[PDB]
């Protein structure tokens, strides 16, 4: 295994450690009852449908601060047991439809510090016992309607430092296990009726609302959002 990966592998603990080796493809003769595969730091910059075929024993995968720019939309597809999916800081500019579909039992998705612009509209609708998911640093122009309605266990959703206006009415309606939310480094526009959904959401949640720091969400134009009501707008919404 250590001779034909060229990472450490510990059998005992059904990991392959890659950690800041570098890699010019992800390596052959990963043991197939692998549980934990380390591949952060290895300037990764593409995978494949194959890269990780018959890891069907996998529940944590990171592949963290390397240069991938784009995903095959069924490079995950086999990896049914996953727990946690590290993709934080690489150069992510898109995600493929159904990229996360076969990872039903995700607990933990990191997805801060890309390049995404845009999510596609049911990209997380599977995840159902997503706790955590990180989407902070990234470019966000928007969030689809119904982004997050599937994520009923969620506990964590990092939105900061992206390049919102505004959320969906009603975004965060069905995240009733809801304990952060990052919000701060966006550029809410609020003199668009878009925004009040927003700002009582925040009055009403702003335990909940961390940098606790409700009053860091802030307008464009210097107004804290959680301040600002139909009456702010001249009854106009």
Same mark, same amino acid.
């Given at each position: 295994?250590?001779?034909?990966?060229?990472?450490?592998?510990?059998?005992?603990?059904?990991?392959?450690?890659?950690? !800041?080796?570098? $890699?010019? %493809?992800? #390596? @052959? +003769?990963?043991?197939?009852?692998?549980? /934990? =595969?380390?591949?952060?730091?290895?300037?990764?910059?593409?995978?494949?449908?194959?890269?990780?075929?018959?890891?069907?024993?996998?529940?944590?995968?990171?592949?963290?601060?390397?240069?991938?720019?784009?995903?095959?939309?069924?490079?995950?597809?086999?990896?049914?047991?996953?727990?946690?999916?590290?993709?934080?800081?690489?150069?992510?500019?898109?995600?493929?439809?159904?990229?996360?579909?076969?990872?039903?039992?995700?607990?933990?998705?990191?997805?801060? !510090?890309?390049? $995404?612009? %845009?999510? #596609? @509209? +049911?990209?997380?609708?599977?995840?159902? /016992? =997503?706790?955590?998911?990180?989407?902070?640093?990234?470019?966000?122009?928007?969030?689809?309607?119904?982004?997050?309605?599937?994520?009923?266990?969620?506990?964590?959703?990092?939105?900061?430092?992206?390049?919102?206006?505004?959320?969906?009415?009603?975004?965060?309606?069905?995240?009733?296990?809801?304990?952060?939310?990052?919000?701060?480094?966006?550029?809410?526009?609020?003199?668009?009726?878009?925004?009040?959904?927003?700002?009582?959401?925040?009055?009403?949640?702003?335990?909940?609302?961390?940098?606790?720091?409700?009053?860091?969400?802030?307008?464009?134009?210097?107004?804290?959002?959680?301040?600002?009501?139909?009456?702010?707008?001249?009854?106009?919404?």
């Amino acid at each position: 295994c250590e001779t034909v990966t060229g990472c450490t592998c510990n059998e005992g603990k059904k990991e392959v450690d890659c950690q !800041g080796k570098s $890699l010019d %493809s992800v #390596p @052959s +003769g990963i043991p197939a009852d692998t549980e /934990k =595969l380390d591949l952060q730091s290895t300037g990764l910059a593409t995978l494949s449908d194959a890269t990780f075929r018959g890891l069907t024993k996998l529940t944590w995968l990171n592949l963290d601060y390397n240069q991938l720019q784009t995903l095959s939309a069924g490079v995950f597809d086999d990896l049914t047991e996953l727990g946690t999916l590290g993709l934080a800081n690489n150069q992510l500019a898109s995600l493929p439809l159904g990229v996360f579909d076969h990872l039903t039992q995700l607990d933990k998705l990191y997805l801060g !510090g890309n390049q $995404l612009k %845009s999510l #596609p @509209s +049911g990209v997380f609708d599977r995840l159902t /016992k =997503l706790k955590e998911l990180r989407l902070n640093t990234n470019q966000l122009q928007s969030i689809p309607a119904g982004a997050f309605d599937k994520l009923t266990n969620l506990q964590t959703l990092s939105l900061s430092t992206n390049q919102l206006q505004s959320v969906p009415h009603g975004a965060f309606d069905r995240l009733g296990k809801l304990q952060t939310i990052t919000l701060f480094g966006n550029q809410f526009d609020c003199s668009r009726c878009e925004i009040l959904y927003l700002s009582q959401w925040i009055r009403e949640n702003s335990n909940k609302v961390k940098d606790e720091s409700p009053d860091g969400v802030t307008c464009s134009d210097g107004k804290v959002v959680r301040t600002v009501t139909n009456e702010t707008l001249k009854y106009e919404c």
